[PDB]
Paper text:
Notably, methods such as RESOLFT (REversible Saturable OpticaL Fluorescence Transitions), nonlinear SIM (Structured Illumination Microscopy)5 or pcSOFI (photochromic Stochastic Optical Fluctuation Imaging)6 exploit reversibly switchable fluorescent proteins (RSFPs) that are able to repeatedly toggle between a fluorescent (‘on’) and a non-fluorescent (‘off’) state. In so-called “negative switching” green RSFPs, the on-to-off transition competes with fluorescence emission upon illumination by cyan light (~490 nm), while the off-to-on transition promptly responds to illumination by violet light (~405 nm). However, the development of RESOLFT nanoscopy in live cells necessitates RSFPs that switch efficiently even at low illumination power (to minimise photo-damage), display minimal residual fluorescence in the off state (to maximise contrast), and are highly resistant against switching fatigue (to sustain a large number of successive on-off switching cycles). It was found that variants engineered from fluorescent proteins of hydrozoan origin (jellyfishes), and notably from the well-known EGFP, could fulfil these requirements, giving rise to rsEGFP15 and rsEGFP216. To shed light on the switching mechanisms of rsFolder and rsEGFP2, we solved their crystallographic structures in both the on and off states.
The four point mutations that allowed evolving EGFP into rsEGFP2 (T65A, Q69L, V163S, A206K)16 were thus engineered in Superfolder-[name], yielding a new PTFP that we named rsFolder. Thus, when compared to rsEGFP2, rsFolder exhibits six point mutations (S31R, N40Y, S100F, T106N, Y146F and M154T), only one of which occurs in the vicinity of the chromophore (Y146F). As rsEGFP2, rsFolder is an efficient negative photoswitcher, both in purified form and in live cells. Thus, photophysical and biochemical data suggest that rsFolder has inherited both the fast folding properties of Superfolder-[name] and the fast switching properties of rsEGFP2. Models were refined at 1.45 Å (on state) and 1.50 Å (off state) resolution for rsEGFP2, and at 1.50 Å (on state) and 2.35 Å (off state) resolution for rsFolder, respectively. In the on state, the phenolate oxygen of the cis chromophore is H-bonded to Thr204, a water molecule and His149. Upon isomerisation the interactions with the two first partners are lost, while His149 and the phenolate oxygen remain H-bonded, resulting in a trans conformation of the chromophore that is a mirror image of the cis conformation. In rsEGFP2 and rsFolder, on the contrary, no such reorganisation of H-bonding networks is observed and the structural changes are restricted to the near environment of the chromophore phenolate.
Author numbering: 1 to 65, 69 to 233
The structure:
Amino acid sequence: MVSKGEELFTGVVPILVELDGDVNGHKFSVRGEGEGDATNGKLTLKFICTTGKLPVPWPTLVTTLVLCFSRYPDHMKRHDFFKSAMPEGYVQERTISFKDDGTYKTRAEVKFEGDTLVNRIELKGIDFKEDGNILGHKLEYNFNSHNVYITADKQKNGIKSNFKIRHNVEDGSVQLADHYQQNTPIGDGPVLLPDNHYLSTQSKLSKDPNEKRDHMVLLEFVTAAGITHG
Protein backbone atom coordinates (compact mmCIF):
# COMPACT_ATOMS: atom_id res chain seq x y z
CA MET A 1 0.00 0.00 0.00
CA VAL A 2 1.38 3.43 -0.95
CA SER A 3 -1.71 5.38 0.10
CA LYS A 4 -4.19 4.84 2.96
CA GLY A 5 -6.95 5.15 0.33
CA GLU A 6 -5.57 2.22 -1.60
CA GLU A 7 -6.39 -0.06 1.39
CA LEU A 8 -10.08 0.49 0.69
CA PHE A 9 -9.72 -1.20 -2.71
CA THR A 10 -8.10 -4.54 -1.89
CA GLY A 11 -11.29 -6.38 -2.86
CA VAL A 12 -14.74 -5.94 -4.40
CA VAL A 13 -16.53 -2.74 -3.39
CA PRO A 14 -20.22 -2.00 -3.85
CA ILE A 15 -21.14 1.09 -5.86
CA LEU A 16 -24.05 3.51 -6.03
CA VAL A 17 -24.36 6.05 -8.88
CA GLU A 18 -26.90 8.91 -8.85
CA LEU A 19 -27.30 11.47 -11.63
CA ASP A 20 -29.66 14.41 -11.93
CA GLY A 21 -29.65 15.88 -15.43
CA ASP A 22 -31.17 18.62 -17.56
CA VAL A 23 -30.53 18.59 -21.31
CA ASN A 24 -32.16 21.48 -23.21
CA GLY A 25 -34.63 21.64 -20.35
CA HIS A 26 -35.48 17.88 -20.45
CA LYS A 27 -35.09 16.84 -16.79
CA PHE A 28 -34.17 13.23 -15.97
CA SER A 29 -32.52 11.16 -13.27
CA VAL A 30 -30.48 8.00 -13.32
CA ARG A 31 -29.59 5.55 -10.56
CA GLY A 32 -27.08 2.73 -10.92
CA GLU A 33 -25.75 0.02 -8.69
CA GLY A 34 -23.19 -2.72 -8.88
CA GLU A 35 -19.62 -3.27 -7.85
CA GLY A 36 -16.02 -2.55 -8.75
CA ASP A 37 -12.70 -4.32 -8.19
CA ALA A 38 -9.54 -2.34 -8.68
CA THR A 39 -7.44 -5.50 -8.28
CA ASN A 40 -8.61 -6.69 -11.70
CA GLY A 41 -9.98 -3.42 -13.14
CA LYS A 42 -13.53 -4.82 -13.51
CA LEU A 43 -16.68 -2.71 -13.10
CA THR A 44 -20.20 -4.12 -13.35
CA LEU A 45 -23.07 -1.62 -13.18
CA LYS A 46 -26.76 -1.52 -14.03
CA PHE A 47 -28.40 1.86 -14.49
CA ILE A 48 -32.07 2.85 -14.63
CA CYS A 49 -33.66 6.08 -15.80
CA THR A 50 -35.87 6.71 -12.79
CA THR A 51 -37.92 9.44 -14.41
CA GLY A 52 -39.11 7.50 -17.45
CA LYS A 53 -37.51 7.57 -20.90
CA LEU A 54 -33.96 8.82 -21.07
CA PRO A 55 -33.96 11.93 -23.30
CA VAL A 56 -30.36 11.31 -24.54
CA PRO A 57 -28.65 8.12 -25.75
CA TRP A 58 -27.26 5.94 -22.98
CA PRO A 59 -23.78 5.77 -24.60
CA THR A 60 -23.42 9.57 -24.14
CA LEU A 61 -23.60 9.07 -20.35
CA VAL A 62 -21.10 6.20 -19.97
CA THR A 63 -18.11 8.42 -19.10
CA THR A 64 -20.11 10.51 -16.62
CA LEU A 65 -21.67 7.55 -14.79
CA VAL A 66 -15.42 5.82 -10.99
CA LEU A 67 -11.78 5.78 -12.08
CA CYS A 68 -10.76 4.76 -8.54
CA PHE A 69 -11.50 1.26 -9.85
CA SER A 70 -8.75 1.42 -12.45
CA ARG A 71 -6.20 -1.38 -12.12
CA TYR A 72 -2.88 0.30 -11.42
CA PRO A 73 0.01 -2.10 -11.92
CA ASP A 74 2.35 -2.63 -9.03
CA HIS A 75 5.06 -0.38 -10.51
CA MET A 76 2.49 2.43 -10.91
CA LYS A 77 0.90 2.43 -7.45
CA ARG A 78 2.47 5.76 -6.55
CA HIS A 79 0.67 7.38 -9.51
CA ASP A 80 -2.88 6.54 -8.44
CA PHE A 81 -4.44 9.84 -7.48
CA PHE A 82 -7.98 8.49 -7.44
CA LYS A 83 -7.59 5.97 -4.63
CA SER A 84 -5.30 8.32 -2.67
CA ALA A 85 -8.14 10.80 -2.18
CA MET A 86 -10.32 8.12 -0.48
CA PRO A 87 -12.32 7.84 1.62
CA GLU A 88 -13.20 11.56 1.66
CA GLY A 89 -13.07 11.43 -2.10
CA TYR A 90 -12.75 13.73 -5.06
CA VAL A 91 -14.70 16.12 -7.25
CA GLN A 92 -14.76 15.17 -10.90
CA GLU A 93 -15.76 17.91 -13.32
CA ARG A 94 -16.09 17.76 -17.05
CA THR A 95 -17.04 19.68 -20.09
CA ILE A 96 -18.10 17.33 -22.89
CA SER A 97 -18.39 19.04 -26.27
CA PHE A 98 -20.34 17.12 -28.85
CA LYS A 99 -18.89 18.12 -32.23
CA ASP A 100 -21.36 20.25 -34.20
CA ASP A 101 -23.86 19.89 -31.34
CA GLY A 102 -24.40 20.68 -27.67
CA THR A 103 -22.29 20.42 -24.53
CA TYR A 104 -22.65 18.57 -21.24
CA LYS A 105 -21.25 20.16 -18.08
CA THR A 106 -20.89 17.76 -15.21
CA ARG A 107 -19.93 17.93 -11.57
CA ALA A 108 -19.61 14.78 -9.50
CA GLU A 109 -18.48 13.72 -6.09
CA VAL A 110 -16.86 10.31 -5.79
CA LYS A 111 -16.49 9.24 -2.20
CA PHE A 112 -17.29 6.56 0.30
CA GLU A 113 -20.68 6.83 2.03
CA GLY A 114 -20.75 4.07 4.60
CA ASP A 115 -19.11 1.09 2.90
CA THR A 116 -20.38 2.05 -0.59
CA LEU A 117 -18.38 3.96 -3.19
CA VAL A 118 -20.78 6.64 -4.42
CA ASN A 119 -20.62 8.67 -7.62
CA ARG A 120 -23.16 11.51 -7.37
CA ILE A 121 -23.51 13.70 -10.39
CA GLU A 122 -25.16 16.88 -11.57
CA LEU A 123 -25.37 17.24 -15.34
CA LYS A 124 -26.46 20.24 -17.46
CA GLY A 125 -26.74 19.88 -21.22
CA ILE A 126 -27.08 22.97 -23.47
CA ASP A 127 -27.32 23.92 -27.14
CA PHE A 128 -28.29 20.52 -28.50
CA LYS A 129 -29.93 20.28 -31.90
CA GLU A 130 -33.46 18.91 -31.84
CA ASP A 131 -32.61 16.86 -34.94
CA GLY A 132 -29.01 16.09 -33.97
CA ASN A 133 -27.48 12.71 -33.15
CA ILE A 134 -28.09 13.15 -29.41
CA LEU A 135 -31.66 14.45 -28.98
CA GLY A 136 -32.64 12.52 -32.11
CA HIS A 137 -31.28 9.25 -30.64
CA LYS A 138 -29.12 8.41 -33.68
CA LEU A 139 -26.28 6.75 -31.76
CA GLU A 140 -25.60 3.02 -31.84
CA TYR A 141 -25.89 1.15 -28.51
CA ASN A 142 -22.20 0.35 -28.18
CA PHE A 143 -18.99 1.83 -26.90
CA ASN A 144 -15.44 1.95 -28.10
CA SER A 145 -12.16 1.23 -26.27
CA HIS A 146 -10.04 4.33 -25.43
CA ASN A 147 -6.82 5.57 -23.93
CA VAL A 148 -7.46 8.37 -21.40
CA TYR A 149 -4.31 10.36 -20.70
CA ILE A 150 -3.80 11.53 -17.07
CA THR A 151 -1.65 14.54 -16.05
CA ALA A 152 -0.94 16.10 -12.69
CA ASP A 153 -2.46 19.48 -11.87
CA LYS A 154 -0.11 20.61 -9.05
CA GLN A 155 -1.90 23.94 -8.57
CA LYS A 156 -5.21 22.30 -7.79
CA ASN A 157 -3.59 19.32 -6.02
CA GLY A 158 -5.31 16.99 -8.46
CA ILE A 159 -5.28 15.70 -12.02
CA LYS A 160 -6.65 16.66 -15.40
CA SER A 161 -7.41 14.76 -18.64
CA ASN A 162 -8.70 15.53 -22.12
CA PHE A 163 -9.81 12.87 -24.55
CA LYS A 164 -12.13 12.25 -27.44
CA ILE A 165 -14.88 9.68 -27.40
CA ARG A 166 -16.11 8.44 -30.77
CA HIS A 167 -19.76 7.46 -30.78
CA ASN A 168 -20.88 5.37 -33.76
CA VAL A 169 -23.89 6.84 -35.57
CA GLU A 170 -26.60 4.69 -37.15
CA ASP A 171 -25.88 6.20 -40.60
CA GLY A 172 -22.26 5.02 -40.47
CA SER A 173 -20.82 8.40 -39.44
CA VAL A 174 -19.13 9.17 -36.10
CA GLN A 175 -20.17 11.63 -33.41
CA LEU A 176 -17.16 13.03 -31.55
CA ALA A 177 -17.44 13.98 -27.88
CA ASP A 178 -14.45 15.96 -26.70
CA HIS A 179 -13.92 15.56 -22.96
CA TYR A 180 -12.06 18.01 -20.71
CA GLN A 181 -11.77 16.83 -17.15
CA GLN A 182 -10.46 17.99 -13.76
CA ASN A 183 -10.35 16.11 -10.46
CA THR A 184 -9.64 17.70 -7.06
CA PRO A 185 -9.64 16.16 -3.59
CA ILE A 186 -12.64 16.80 -1.33
CA GLY A 187 -10.35 16.52 1.73
CA ASP A 188 -7.14 18.41 2.55
CA GLY A 189 -5.04 15.37 3.46
CA PRO A 190 -2.16 14.29 1.22
CA VAL A 191 -2.73 12.79 -2.25
CA LEU A 192 -0.56 11.18 -4.92
CA LEU A 193 0.17 13.42 -7.90
CA PRO A 194 1.14 11.27 -10.86
CA ASP A 195 3.72 11.29 -13.61
CA ASN A 196 2.14 11.31 -17.11
CA HIS A 197 0.39 8.05 -17.96
CA TYR A 198 -2.89 6.78 -19.41
CA LEU A 199 -5.87 4.56 -18.63
CA SER A 200 -6.85 1.90 -21.16
CA THR A 201 -10.60 1.35 -21.20
CA GLN A 202 -13.04 -1.15 -22.69
CA SER A 203 -16.79 -1.20 -22.22
CA LYS A 204 -19.62 -3.54 -23.19
CA LEU A 205 -23.22 -2.31 -23.11
CA SER A 206 -26.17 -4.70 -22.80
CA LYS A 207 -29.76 -5.03 -21.63
CA ASP A 208 -31.37 -6.99 -18.78
CA PRO A 209 -34.11 -9.13 -20.43
CA ASN A 210 -36.36 -8.77 -17.34
CA GLU A 211 -36.03 -5.00 -17.01
CA LYS A 212 -38.88 -3.03 -18.60
CA ARG A 213 -37.57 0.39 -17.52
CA ASP A 214 -35.14 2.32 -19.71
CA HIS A 215 -31.77 1.07 -18.61
CA MET A 216 -28.17 0.18 -19.42
CA VAL A 217 -26.03 -2.68 -18.22
CA LEU A 218 -22.33 -1.89 -18.29
CA LEU A 219 -19.30 -4.19 -18.06
CA GLU A 220 -16.04 -2.23 -18.10
CA PHE A 221 -12.35 -2.84 -17.61
CA VAL A 222 -9.89 -0.01 -16.94
CA THR A 223 -6.12 -0.50 -16.61
CA ALA A 224 -3.38 2.05 -16.10
CA ALA A 225 -0.35 2.04 -18.37
CA GLY A 226 2.44 4.18 -19.78
CA ILE A 227 5.07 4.43 -17.02
CA THR A 228 8.46 2.93 -17.95
CA HIS A 229 8.89 1.58 -14.43
CA GLY A 230 7.95 3.31 -11.16
